Amino acid sequence: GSSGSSGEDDPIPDELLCLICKDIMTDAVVIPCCGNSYCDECIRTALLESDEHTCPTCHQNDVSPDALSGPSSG
Ligand SMILES: [Zn+2]
Ligand SMILES: [Zn+2]
């Protein structure tokens, strides 16, 4: 050996991932209804998926989509 870089490391932890597609959340958004990490889109589509805007984590009714920590209109 005698080359270097002797040691295994752990990649981005789960805590830094969404509970939907498990993909880096370019724009972490925390929902008020309950509070969870979801991709700017993940949370966007979700609300759509269901008949109406009903948060997946906690059955909500019209969860303030703007409330999210996204000043870019979402
Ligand atoms: Zn996602
Ligand atoms: Zn919720």
Give the whole-angstrom CA distance, residue 67 versus residue 22: 22
Q: Experimentally, how was this structure solved?
A: NMR
Q: Specify the CATH number for 1-74; select among 3.40.50.2300, 3.90.1210.10, 3.30.40.10, 3.10.20.30.
A: 3.30.40.10
What ranges make up the beta strands (E) of the chain? 29-30, 37-38
Q: How far is the CA of 33 from the centre of ligand 2 (A)?
A: 4
Domain extents in the chain: 1-74
Length of the chain: 74
Q: Which residues pair with 30 in a beta bridge?
A: 37
Rg (alpha carbons) of the chain, rounded to whole number: 17
- Ranges of H-type helices in 1-74: 42-49
Q: How far is the CA of 33 from the centre of ligand 1 (A)?
A: 18
Ligand nearest 54 Cα, by number?
A: 2
Q: How far is the CA of 12 from the centre of ligand 2 (A)?
A: 25
Q: What is the DSSP letter of 14?
A: G
